[PDB]
Amino acid sequence: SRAEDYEVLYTIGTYGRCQKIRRKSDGKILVWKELDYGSMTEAEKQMLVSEVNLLRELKHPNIVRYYDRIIDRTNTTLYIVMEYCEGGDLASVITKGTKERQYLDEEFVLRVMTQLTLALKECHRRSLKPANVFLDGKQNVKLGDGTPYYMSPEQMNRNEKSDIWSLGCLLYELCALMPPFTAFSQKELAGKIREGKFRRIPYRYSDELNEIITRMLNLKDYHRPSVEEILENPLILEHHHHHH
Ligand SMILES: COc1cc(-c2cnc(N)c(-c3ccc(C(=O)O)c(C)c3)n2)cc(OC)c1OC
Ligand SMILES: [Cl-]
Ligand SMILES: [Cl-]
Ligand SMILES: [Cl-]
Ligand SMILES: [Cl-]
């Protein structure tokens, strides 16, 4: 459980620095996240430890798996070691789709829907944006922890159905390659969100898919489908789920 056990291959992104690493013992490819607590108080660090201990708990195929936590008092740096998702995040996929003018396959959208819904179902039992949704090597979707496009109508006033809205917005952006509600100001955005109006996703996508995404974007949280009601949907099949 020491930083010297791992070899840094290259930096992925710059919480702090994120790096792709290889464990020397077996050569397993992973990544870690650097948190410089050097400028933190004993209070902030107290929350930092107990928060990462609760990160250690979540073991689920559709949630990014956390393996280890390495402290280095030398540079006062904390390393959270997690699984490597070779496919990157959904943000890049969406960006890649915009540029190349290609819409994502409906099969892919169903995969994200199914696996992110199972991610939420898991998070709710323990009681959301493209850049926090990752893809591994085997078509698996994994969840991982400034205009608020995905903010629900009630989340600007007053709920698990709020997550369904956020998922609704994410899936919509996967289909249309843009968020359901766009605006240059947060007050404009707020305006559009309360009106609850948006375009249909591209017509290459079936009415069935459009229907469910639309239901998730319902203004009444109680009209939105529950995690259960989503998975009962005839669209969602076994091959849309995770596979090792
Ligand atoms: C942001 O862009 C990318 C991210 C990744 C990647 C792979 N595995 C990971 N575990 C993560 C990652 C990094 C940080 C965090 C976080 O807790 O903040 C998470 C949840 C995942 N990212 C891989 C990438 O390679 C394709 C990539 O594209 C350059
Ligand atoms: Cl396009
Ligand atoms: Cl398609
Ligand atoms: Cl309406
Ligand atoms: Cl359209």
101 CA to centre of ligand 2 in angstroms: 4
Please count the structural domains in the chain: 2
Distance from C-alpha of 172 to C-alpha of 116, rounded to nearest angstrom: 14
What's the gap in Å between 140 CA and the centre of ligand 2? 24
- Please provide residue 64's backbone torsions phi and psi, each rounded to the nearest 5 degrees: -50, 125
Pair (186, 213) in one structural domain: yes
- Which residue's CA lies nearest to atom 21 of ligand 1? 144
93 and 6 within one domain: no
Chain centroid offset of residue 225 CA: 19
2 and 121 within one domain? no
**Burial letters for 25-35: b for 16+ Cβ neighbours within 10 Å, e otherwise?**
eeeeebbbbbb
Contact indicator for 145, 132 with CB cutoff of 8 Å: yes
Count of residues in the chain: 244
159 and 213 together in one domain: yes
CATH code, 76: 3.30.200.20
Show binding-site residues for ATP.
12-18, 33
Residues with CB under 6 A from ligand 1: 12-13, 15, 18, 31, 33, 64, 82-85, 88-89, 92, 134, 144-145
Q: Do both 94 and 161 map to the same domain?
A: yes
Which residues share a beta bridge with 83? 30
Same domain, 187 and 240: yes
Q: Among the bound ligands, name the one nearest to the CA of residue 105.
A: 3
> What is the three-class DSSP state of 51?
helix
Domain assignment of residue 77, given as a range: 1-41+65-85
Structure tokens, 165: 């809205």
Estimate the share of the chain in helix, then strand, then coil, as percent rounded to the nearest 5: 45, 20, 40
Given a contact cutoff of 8 angstroms between Cβ atoms, the answer to whether 138 and 244 are in contact is yes
Q: How many CB atoms lie within 10 A of CB 110?
A: 21
CA distance 158 to 25: 50
What CATH number corresponds to the domain at position 167?
A: 1.10.510.10
Q: What residue owns the CA closest to ligand 1's atom 3?
A: 88
For residue 148, report the distance from its CA to the centre of ligand 4, in Å.
20
Pair 90, 135: CB distance under 8 Å: yes
Give CA–CA dist 167/110, Å, rounded: 12
Atom of ligand 1 nearest to the CA of 84: 8
Q: How far is CA 22 from the centre of its chain?
A: 24
What are the φ/ψ torsions at residue 30 (nearest 5 degrees)?
Answer: -140, -175
> Which of 54, 85, 116 delimits the end of a domain?
85
Q: What is the resolution of this structure in A?
A: 2.5
Cα-to-centroid distance, 33 and ligand 1 (Å): 9
Of the CA atoms within 13 Å of residue 94, those in its CB half-sphere come to: 21
